[PDB]
Design an enzyme around this catalytic site. Structure first.
Site, PDB file in Angstrom:
ATOM      1  N   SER A 188      -0.820  15.510 -12.101  1.00  0.00           N
ATOM      2  CA  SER A 188      -1.066  15.135 -13.482  1.00  0.00           C
ATOM      3  C   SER A 188      -1.318  16.385 -14.305  1.00  0.00           C
ATOM      4  CB  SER A 188      -2.257  14.185 -13.554  1.00  0.00           C
ATOM      5  OG  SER A 188      -2.649  13.916 -14.888  1.00  0.00           O
TER       6      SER A 188
ATOM      7  N   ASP B   1       0.820  -1.202   0.000  1.00  0.00           N
ATOM      8  CA  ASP B   1       0.000   0.000   0.000  1.00  0.00           C
ATOM      9  C   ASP B   1       0.853   1.252   0.000  1.00  0.00           C
ATOM     10  OD1 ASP B   1      -1.939   1.927   0.388  1.00  0.00           O
ATOM     11  OD2 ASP B   1      -2.422   1.321   2.444  1.00  0.00           O
TER      12      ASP B   1
END
Length: 330
Positions: free
Chosen positions: A199, A35
């Site tokens: 992004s 994770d």
């Protein structure tokens, strides 16, 4: 040193991925959920409340000659779904894919929430976010990667998750045969303890690319792709009959649909998520309503590039003094 381990979807939907991890002496192999959005290595154990164990493999510290109680240390963590776990702490030898760390904090669960009990395939978590998120008190502990880093050939790990197939976590090297083209690297903020990046935009299907900054986390421990409501609405508007269902808890679509791809930007580069990656199947057994793999982050407080996005890429988690993220097509 290096390590390399195969990671395997837990079910036919790729709801999560498990990776075998050797703990203790002799080794006890547990299948952990790696994770990159948390920083605790915790396991089902011989200390876990018996009624809360249902099919998981447990760590038994008393059977490990290298286990030592970390006296006074406790831990307690909550996750993005409202699930949780807590317990005490041992140090022990932990190996992943041939890479060994001695003195790793192994957090033994005394209690786990129902969601964990109900999932027989996950024996615990191995956190790979920054150690600043580790929950051990009163002395915070380091992640497996943080402990291994100085010994690694290069201070990196890579995630290469498969779509409905196994993939690989590598530590200490970049497998140049595992991706196509070049790796595009992008800046990371560690201020919130995550592999947080920005992004450069998105496209839906064969549509034009929208240049827009989307801050979010690279999170192998989240199944879906969580993005701003505007982006998510633009995606699902291209699927006939798709709608946001308050009762179901997100966007659903007719199972008869053919889903468009979704592209996200990494600098000037582009990662394409095929439409099929966005199908999470019937909302309940036998239903013709299917659950979407792109969902709104509104009310989470952060955007999450979870497995849906990451599995479309070869992803480099660069833990150099100034961390960065790399993405390549594959």
């Amino acid at each position: 040193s290096t390590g390399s381990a195969t990671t395997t979807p837990i079910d036919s939907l790729d709801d999560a991925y498990i990776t075998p991890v050797q703990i203790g002496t002799p080794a006890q192999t547990l299948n952990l959920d790696f994770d990159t959005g948390s920083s605790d290595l915790w396991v089902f154990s011989s200390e876990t409340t018996a009624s809360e164990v249902d099919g998981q493999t447990i760590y038994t510290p008393s059977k490990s000659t290298t286990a030592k109680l970390l006296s006074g240390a406790t831990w307690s963590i909550s996750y993005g779904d409202g699930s949780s776990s807590s317990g005490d702490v041992y140090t022990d030898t932990v190996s992943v894919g041939g890479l060994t760390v001695t003195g790793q904090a192994v957090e033994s669960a005394k209690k786990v929430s129902s969601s964990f009990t109900e999932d027989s395939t996950i024996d615990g978590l191995l956190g790979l976010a920054f150690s600043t998120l580790n929950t051990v008190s009163p002395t915070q502990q380091k992640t497996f990667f943080d402990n291994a880093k100085a010994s690694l050939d290069s201070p990196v790990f890579t995630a290469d998750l498969g779509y409905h197939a196994p993939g690989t976590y590598n530590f200490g090297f970049i497998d140049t045969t595992a991706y196509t083209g070049s790796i595009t690297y992008t800046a990371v903020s560690t201020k919130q303890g995550f592999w947080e990046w920005t992004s450069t935009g998105y496209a839906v299907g064969s549509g034009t690319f929208k240049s827009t900054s989307i801050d979010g986390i690279a999170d192998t421990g989240t199944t879906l792709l969580y993005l701003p409501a505007t982006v998510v609405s633009a995606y699902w508007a291209q699927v006939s009959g798709a709608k946001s269902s308050s009762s179901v808890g997100g966007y659903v679509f007719p199972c008869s649909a053919t889903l468009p791809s979704f592209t996200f930007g990494v600098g000037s580069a582009r990662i394409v998520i095929p439409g099929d990656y966005i199908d999470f199947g019937p909302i309940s057994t036998g239903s013709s309503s299917c659950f979407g793999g792109i969902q709104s982050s509104a009310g989470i407080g952060i955007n999450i590039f979870g497995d849906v996005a990451l599995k479309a890429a070869f992803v480099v988690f660069n833990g150099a003094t100034t961390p960065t993220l790399g993405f390549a097509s594959k």
